[PDB]
Amino acid sequence: PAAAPGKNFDLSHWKLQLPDANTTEISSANLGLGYTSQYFYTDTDGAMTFWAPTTGGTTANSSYPRSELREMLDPSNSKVNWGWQGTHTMKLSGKTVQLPSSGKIIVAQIHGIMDDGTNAPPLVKAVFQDGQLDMQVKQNSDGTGSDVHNYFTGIKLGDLYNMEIRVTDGVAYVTMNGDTRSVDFVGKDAGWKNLKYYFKAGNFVQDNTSTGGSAIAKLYSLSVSHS
Numbered sequence: 001p002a003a004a005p006g007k008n009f010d011l012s013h014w015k016l017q018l019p020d021a022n023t024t025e026i027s028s029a030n031l032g033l034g035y036t037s038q039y040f041y042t043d044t045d046g047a048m049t050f051w052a053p054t055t056g057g058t059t060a061n062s063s064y065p066r067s068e069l070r071e072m073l074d075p076s077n078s079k080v081n082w083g084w085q086g087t088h089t090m091k092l093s094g095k096t097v098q099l100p101s102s103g104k105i106i107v108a109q110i111h112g113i114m115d116d117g118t119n120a121p122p123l124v125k126a127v128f129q130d131g132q133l134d135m136q137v138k139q140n141s142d143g144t145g146s147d148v149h150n151y152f153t154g155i156k157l158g159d160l161y162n163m164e165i166r167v168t169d170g171v172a173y174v175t176m177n178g179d180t181r182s183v184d185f186v187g188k189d190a191g192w193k194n195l196k197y198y199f200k201a202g203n204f205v206q207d208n209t210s211t212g213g214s215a216i217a218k219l220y221s222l223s224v225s226h227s
């Protein structure tokens with residue numbers, strides 16, 4: 001009978017994307033009002049808890065299901081997003097409780113988006129496996145090329161991680177447990193200046209197999225700042 005996550009976290013500038021068959025989205029307002037379900041709930045430890053099955057519905061340009069928050073600078077218009085200039089920082093603490101058969105989920109992101117709201121590549125993906133978090137930074141803004149890996153080894157299932165993802169003036173700074181690495185993405189491809197960005201945090205399950213099971217990820221803190 002614990003309070004729902006929207007009472008414990010500031011979700012006024014997040015919407016929730018779900019792994020039901022119809023990939024339903026829950027508005028910022030409904031999160032604040034106390035939305036909770038099998039996909040999104042407060043656990044006994046107070047954590048904002050994201051559950052998604054590998055059989056879940058998937059968004060138009062992903063093969064994989066998610067129960068994941070999507071940052072909304074304007075909760076009434078998803079086309080309003082931030083740019084490469086200035087400082088944009090997401091901080092979180094959390095843990096991954098259960099993995100699917102693939103042993104891989106994504107627990108935080110910066111996602112690119114076109115000015116018109118059209119999809120663009122992810123910029124940063126925090127990839128969790130039992131024993132390693134890889135904070136991947138995409139090389140090119142058109143999706144060509146590969147990713148710059150940033151491995152933080154020794155992070156296990158159930159361990160508490162403290163994460164920060166920051167963009168300042170076209171450079172990404174990725175931090176786990178006080179260990180920061182940087183990638184100059186605008187310096188790799190000036191095309192990134194032609195995209196906008198939004199944060200994501202939750203449980204984006206890198207397994208779509210019918211027998212893959214499901215994943216659980218938890219957050220104990222989540223904050224975003226733009227300056």
Ligand SMILES: O=C(O)[C@H]1O[C@@H](O[C@H]2[C@H](O)[C@H](O)[C@H](O[C@H]3[C@H](O)[C@H](O)[C@H](O)O[C@H]3C(=O)O)O[C@@H]2C(=O)O)[C@@H](O)[C@@H](O)[C@@H]1O
Binds near residue numbers: 060070109121204
């Ligand atoms: O790394 C990834 O997250 C993964 O996501 C894929 O893009 C998704 C993106 O994560 C959002 O879920 C986005 O949400 C938009 C979609 O149209 C949705 O139905 C609703 O209308 O809201 C939209 C929004 O908030 O902008 O949908 C994207 C999508 O088109 O699938 C891909 O980038 C994938 O390759 C990537 O690995």
